[PDB]
Amino acid sequence: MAFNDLLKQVGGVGRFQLIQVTMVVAPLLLMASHNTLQNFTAAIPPHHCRPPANANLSKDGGLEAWLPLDKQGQPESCLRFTSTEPCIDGWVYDNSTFPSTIVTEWNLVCSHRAFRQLAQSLYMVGVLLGAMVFGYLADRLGRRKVLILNYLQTAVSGTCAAYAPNYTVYCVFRLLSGMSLASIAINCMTLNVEWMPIHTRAYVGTLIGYVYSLGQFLLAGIAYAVPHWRHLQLVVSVPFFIAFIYSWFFIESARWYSSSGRLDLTLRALQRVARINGKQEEGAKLSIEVLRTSLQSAMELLRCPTLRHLFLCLSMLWFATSFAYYGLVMDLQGFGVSMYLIQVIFGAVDLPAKFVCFLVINSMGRRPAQMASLLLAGICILVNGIIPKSHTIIRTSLAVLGKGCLASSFNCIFLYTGELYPTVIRQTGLGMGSTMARVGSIVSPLVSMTAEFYPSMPLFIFGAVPVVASAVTALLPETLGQPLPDTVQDLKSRSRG
Ligand SMILES: O=C(O)CCC(=O)C(=O)O
Ligand SMILES: [Cl-]
Numbered sequence: 365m366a367f368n369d370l371l372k373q374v375g376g377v378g379r380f381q382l383i384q385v386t387m388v389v390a391p392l393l394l395m396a397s398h399n400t401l402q403n404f405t406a407a408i409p410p411h412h413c414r415p416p417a418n419a420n421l422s423k424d425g426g427l428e429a430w431l432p433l434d435k436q437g438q439p440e441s442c443l444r445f446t447s448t449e450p451c452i453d454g455w456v457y458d459n460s461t462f463p464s465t466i467v468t469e470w471n472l473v474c475s476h477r478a479f480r481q482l483a484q485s486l487y488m489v490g491v492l493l494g495a496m497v498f499g500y501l502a503d504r505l506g507r508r509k510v511l512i513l514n515y516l517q518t519a520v521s522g523t524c525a526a527y528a529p530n531y532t533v534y535c536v537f538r539l540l541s542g543m544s545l546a547s548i549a550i551n552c553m554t555l556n557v558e559w560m561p562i563h564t565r566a567y568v569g570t571l572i573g574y575v576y577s578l579g580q581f582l583l584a585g586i587a588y589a590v591p592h593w594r595h596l597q598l599v600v601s602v603p604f605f606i607a608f609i610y611s612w613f614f615i616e617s618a619r620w621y622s623s624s625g626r627l628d629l630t631l632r633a634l635q636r637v638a639r640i641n642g643k644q645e646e647g648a649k650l651s652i653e654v655l656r657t658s659l660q661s662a663m664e665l666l667r668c669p670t671l672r673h674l675f676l677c678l679s680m681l682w683f684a685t686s687f688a689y690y691g692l693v694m695d696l697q698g699f700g701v702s703m704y705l706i707q708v709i710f711g712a713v714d715l716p717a718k719f720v721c722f723l724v725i726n727s728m729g730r731r732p733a734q735m736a737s738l739l740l741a742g743i744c745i746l747v748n749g750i751i752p753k754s755h756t757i758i759r760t761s762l763a764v765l766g767k768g769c770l771a772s773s774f775n776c777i778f779l780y781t782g783e784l785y786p787t788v789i790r791q792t793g794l795g796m797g798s799t800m801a802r803v804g805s806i807v808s809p810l811v812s813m814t815a816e817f818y819p820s821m822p823l824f825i826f827g828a829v830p831v832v833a834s835a836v837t838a839l840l841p842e843t844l845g846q847p848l849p850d851t852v853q854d855l856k857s858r859s860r861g
Pocket of ligand 1: 569576718775
């Protein structure tokens with residue numbers, strides 16, 4: 365005698381439900397493309413100091429006299445000769461491969477080498493803030509108006525970032541884009557789960573994952589189609605405009621209406637669902653009286669000792685997983701092969717890794733799967749960072765294996781943290797873990813910023829942190845017995861056993 369009873373009465377596989385899920389999961393390809401866009405919209409082409417116009421190249425016999433060479437047989441990327449001196453007349457970029465990126469229009473090079481990483485860090489700060497505050501805003505307003513606001517904000521911010529007079533405007537609009545995009549990312553699954561019955565909830569989760577993979581495909585497709593960054597960003601952001609346009613056709617989740625103390629809206633929504641589903645005859649029996657008889661915290665997380673330890677461990681796990689995943693995904697320039705091919709192979713490797721990880725976690729365990737994922741990924745990143753730049757195919761195979769390992773790690777940590785926490789604070793634990801993953805994704809570009817000290821130290825850290833987290837995760841209890849802890853006391857009793 366719960367909400368699921370009425371949900372099954374009205375259907376569960378009906379036309380409205382399938383249409384709504386296949387409609388709401390649709391912008392997740394644009395989610396993936398927007399998250400990974402910095403690879404194609406901020407690629408660094410080879411460049412050198414432009415010789416001053418005072419000297420003539422006709423009498424100089426070439427451009428070698430006005431440009432010092434580096435050890436790799438290329439003109440120096442930050443110096444120019446006096447007859448040395450830093451760039452004073454700008455930079456010269458080629459157009460053989462990348463017609464234009466941000467580092468060629470606003471010359472984010474030399475002294476301003478860290479500005480692209482700072483912009484990505486600001487986008488991740490926007491992601492964190494648009495999760496933190498928009499979760500409360502959605503809980504206080506709803507799950508449809510918030511979604512349409514997310515659509516509008518992400519589309520407007522994408523277009524405005526595409527047409528940016530300078531770099532500060534770009535960073536601010538990336539902040540706003542992260543806000544809206546994180547909010548839609550965390551509200552899509554919530555609304556879809558809250559409308560689906562029990563089994564189609566897991567079906568919807570798998571659908572969301574597969575759509576993410578298809579989006580990783582679509583990013584490479586668009587990048588091959590559109591090379592210009594000012595046009596690539598516009599092409600990625602345009603379908604979000606029609607998304608906001610047609611997002612008014614969604615139906616709000618009835619569970620949120622019930623939780624708000626009102627049931628007439630719930631009855632109206634269910635009757636509308638039956639009308640779309642065609643089961644008006646069965647939905648007519650629904651009424652306020654029937655619904656009335658059928659519809660019947662972070663402080664303590666850091667207060668309780670065992671809860672505090674468990675939160676610390678889960679925080680480290682989420683932090684390292686997001687760290688490694690974003691750091692490895694957002695670097696497809698120094699891997700030899702072209703960006704589009706490596707990106708499409710990255711998208712292809714996602715699904716088999718997820719299938720293998722699901723088989724492993726349902727076969728032998730979850731914590732050993734997290735071991736064989738995180739430690740393997742860390743070792744892969746270390747050996748990638750130590751392998752000389754000359755090797756290309758080995759580096760690319762290592763990178764795709766690492767991306768598959770990170771996807772498997774993400775799935776395993778989600779499915780493990782879902783059944784770890786007691787039911788009292790499980791949702792808050794999931795939210796805290798997601799926040800820790802987002803702050804790890806915040807810090808990862810900041811770590812990559814430190815490539816000035818050493819060209820390979822960002823990869824070294826990106827590998828090392830997962831290794832430490834894998835060592836840390838060995839102290840977590842195994843949850844193959846499916847005890848499903850209820851409260852803190854139940855957690856304590858099963859901990860000893
Ligand atoms: O592929 C990703 O971006 C995340 C992993 C995934 O498929 C999911 O979280 O559903
Ligand atoms: Cl998120």
